[PDB]
Amino acid sequence: ARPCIPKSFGYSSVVCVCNATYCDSFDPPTFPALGTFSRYESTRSGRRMELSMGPIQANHTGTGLLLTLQPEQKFQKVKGFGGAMTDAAALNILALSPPAQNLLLKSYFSEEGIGYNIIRVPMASCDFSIRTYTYADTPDDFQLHNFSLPEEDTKLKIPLIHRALQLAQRPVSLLASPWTSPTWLKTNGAVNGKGSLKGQPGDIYHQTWARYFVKFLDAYAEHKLQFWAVTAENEPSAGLLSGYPFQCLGFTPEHQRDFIARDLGPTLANSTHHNVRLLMLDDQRLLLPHWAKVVLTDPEAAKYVHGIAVHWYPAKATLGETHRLFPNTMLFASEACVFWEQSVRLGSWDRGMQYSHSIITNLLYHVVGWTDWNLALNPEGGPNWVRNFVDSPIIVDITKDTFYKQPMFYHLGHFSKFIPEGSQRVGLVASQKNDLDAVALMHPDGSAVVVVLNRSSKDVPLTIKDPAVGFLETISPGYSIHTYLWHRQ
Template identity: 60%
Template sequence: MASLLPSLLLMALGFLPAVTLSAGSGKCVARSFGHDSVVCKCNSTYCDSVGSVTLPPLGQYSSYLSNMAGSRLEPGQGQIQVNSTGQGLRLTITSYQKYQRIKGFGGAMTDAAAINIMSLSSGAQEQLLRQYFSSEGIGYSVVRVPMASCDFSTHLYTYADTPEDYNLDNFTLLPEDINMKIPLLQHAQALSPHPLSLLASAWSAPAWMKTNGALTGKGSLKGKPGGKVHKSWAQYYIRFLEEYAKYNLTFWALTTGNEPSAGEMTNYSFQALGFTPEEQRDWVALDLGPALHASSYPHTHVLILDDNRLLLPHWAKVVLSDVHAGRYIHGVAVHWYFDSLVPAEISLGTTHHLYPDYYLFGTEACVGWNALDRGVKLGSWNRAEQYAHDIIEDLNHYVVGWTDWNLALDQTGGPNWVKNFVDSPIIVDAKHDIFYKQPTFYSMAHFSKFLWEGSQRVGVSACGETHLEYSAFIRPDSSVVLIILNRY
């Protein structure tokens, strides 16, 4: 099929044919903080919503437009132009060119996110969670859950801080889990029309398991893969799954550890556990894989790397070329930091073509992490474009899902014990019992709301030169989703 872009989309962030806005959704209550666009203000009784969606009549399309001027998923409709020879740009969707299927989109329930959400009144909490997880909201289906503390915690801890406790007899969840993250995850699951795909990532092993005797800095597991420390660390993962299962929370996947390259850096400032690709390969083959296989959770997916994509394809070559490790692995998890340093075709494309049986999945991204552009910027449209560009680029290079970082932060970009403040799609003002939806929230919405699990990327091409970025999909209901970004 071919469709002509209406002129109103020349300033579009997103454009999605085949969906239409239902009645009853609310308009954004816009507020400016002096940046290049606005935020949408929400409280316990009101928040704008994209609403539920239904398909338009055959031969028509429905669009959603977000732009710097303040449109937020603004609905429109039109007639699909088939084989048009009129003036303007033509995009041709080639449905027989089929690529990867979508898993989902979401964010992370860090300690900081949980603290901020729970700082609101019960009514405002409900509004916030509905924005992310309900059918009226933007349809998040993935939630990344840190195993114990990370930089977005208020203090350092693991679940097994008793020295030499190799059998993990003293393994225990903390109040951050029991009183905050778990109740919020249960609430989010209750709001979601589909089971949430929970993803677990550990930042550091207990200090007594590590070569440097600390949760931070340069340090790896003592001994070698197959040894008692490596086996105990694998059992730590099993115990985590067991404890969360007691609260009826089961995990779709776990990663082999957050940013293993960080634990190889001298004086690294927050929690990390160093692994080389060779060490990760052997730990999966000898310890983690067998432990999962023998547990009550043999179908939990294992994602390697969980680090910046610039480490690909080398990391994948080392780990996935080993048949003993490869049989326990399902995918490769990537972070978005430093994406500009390595073309997606080299890192993601090459990895996919070498190992097509393993999927690629984005597990962390945020803006405001760079020292030159630090912290929260309420209303930044430039940051929304950064998100949309990276997601489209990843999807066009075989990535099956994209997970944002903190679901919610305060106005300073925390709390964060190491003062590593960043931005978030939702910023909470607890003093006034309100929260702001950033432009990045709507960037995420253009993907998470419309690309259902099982949607399949298909071919799409432009007639003539264009600076637009785009990606096309066919959903399980046979409708077409076309997402377009104009950064110029």
């Protein structure tokens, strides 16, 4: 219905300006007839998920590249796409006026937007908080009688999550991750730095930390929010590095294995939230497949682990080999973000290409879902209480009641909007060596989705063949991303 309002900030492409009364949006989707496809196009030149239609022809004539759908070659089923509701994200959204907040939330979660269905919720503070805190900072409270949610949850995070769920067509799955435990449970007595839990898996410390998970889930349940999954610890390897600046909690692979087997696994299974999935790792994929071997060879740990969470910050040696060793334990991208460059580059087409190329690689190596980091940030990449400023698909300018949708937002949306939960990745065979990145999936309803990323400068003429329908003649322009959709019957 409403097109993008472009604005350049000196980088390779434009942002889309939104405020309290205007934001670009989609109409409700349609079901075009057999023999007709839908194409959504975003380009560095300024096109933003523009919709067009064309025919799927019975015959083909030409000399160029051919991608052939192979719907019988079936792979993983998709859980979904989304981003993280951090303190920083919540503060930046709520700095807008209410009408602008809803255009922002609709941009992510509505069918007028790109249809997110995953929200990652940090358990207490991380670096994208304005202060250090946990849910139980009074010491010597091993039964956790003084566990409580601060204003960050009750005032900022939870109300925004409620509003996101109301705007969403598809069911939204919440995913929780802790950064640090209370400091009186740690070896170093600090929120950051090199430090693990006190003692050994099984004792009062590890039982208290595991109970902290149930107490967290109880609190959000009282606020009428249920979680799909929790991770065992955010980037547990970081808590083994000397003098680590952000909130952390150190686990070596065997410590995570024993903590899951003795404490976290049983405690979650004995609780009201026994259906909540447990994801391991939640860390860099270079720690794979080793981290999976350690944890998942132990059946007492493995019986509790539903999946392996990975961060994006070679895929065959990591994701592919881990799938070969443990093909029934799903892989899930739980966090991705973007030395000499500033933290926020308003309008960077490169960082958008980085997002879509990575999602394509993850999908081509069995990953069932991808989760962004901060849903929103200010123009300097904050607030962040340490330093680590990064980019975000939506950048909020408080002083002008305005937010900007980066190219990252649309590169994500080319996947998040058209691959609902339950979609299965299927085969897509290139007729010859080419420079494009492509992935094919099938909706639960049988229709086809194909995303085509062109990171090169040259236009690439392209034909997509569906054995059941025909030939889709198209062109992939240089520095562009397309999504194609068509009924198969």
